[PDB]
Design a protein around this ligand. Structure first.
Ligand SMILES: Cn1c(=O)c2c(ncn2CC2OCCO2)n(C)c1=O
Ligand SMILES: Cn1c(=O)c2c(ncn2CC2OCCO2)n(C)c1=O
Ligand SMILES: Cn1c(=O)c2c(ncn2CC2OCCO2)n(C)c1=O
Lengths: 107, 109
């Protein structure tokens, strides 16, 4: 769809290259990051590499479905991490760009 | 009086305000009433649907994206402050899904 193309080539491209994006480009590796409780707390992991791959393999039936994946990724971050962790500020910065770009998506 | 802001008022706020999970979000978090002495230490930008509703009613917003940020702040405050297992997190998630679903069909411009 026009909307899924926009999420791929306008929204995702802006977020992917952002200087705060690196923690979010691939799944949380709880073993390599040493977080034995991550998957006990976060039951729907999500990340931009997964969303990007889904955008390219025609996984999504509708724009809102892809937007929900973006939301899950950010929400996971807020739920798991402490309020003072830098990664929370990074998610918020990226999430605001997401919402800005989504506001200009074809209707 | 943008089409976008009209959409956010007549479609998004209409749906969320009357939602059965909306009541904890209809007014600012009252930290005294709720017994949350650390709330304003952790949440530095409180937001609630009553504030957003009033702002839409008084044409406070210059752009749709700024109303959208207020909604986002209100949900994010909840995810950041509350424990993962708090029921309020589930209620916020349910409301935010509706918010995103509707925002996907918002007019451009
Ligand atoms: C999304 N996400 C990460 O990407 C992450 C992380 N813990 C480490 N990382 C990677 C990076 O190390 C310093 C800050 O982010 N957690 C708990 C998380 O939620
Ligand atoms: C304080 N308070 C409510 O105000 C409430 C509620 N359950 C429903 N409401 C009312 C709300 O407005 C109309 C539709 O839902 N509970 C459990 C509650 O504690
Ligand atoms: C926004 N907000 C609330 O309104 C709230 C609350 N803790 C309780 N409440 C009220 C209600 O009790 C059961 C479900 O929510 N917290 C920490 C919060 O962030």
């Amino acid at each position: 769809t026009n909307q899924l193309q926009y999420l791929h080539k306008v929204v995702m491209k802006a977020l992917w290259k952002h200087q705060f994006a690196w923690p979010f480009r691939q799944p949380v590796d709880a073993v390599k990051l040493g977080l034995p409780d991550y998957h006990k707390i976060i039951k729907q992991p999500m990340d931009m590499g997964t969303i990007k791959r889904r955008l390219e393999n025609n996984y999504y039936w509708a724009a809102s479905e892809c937007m929900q994946d973006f939301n899950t990724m950010f929400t996971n971050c807020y739920i798991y991490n402490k309020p003072t962790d830098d990664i929370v500020l990074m998610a918020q910065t990226l999430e605001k760009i997401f919402l800005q770009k989504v506001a200009s998506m074809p209707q």
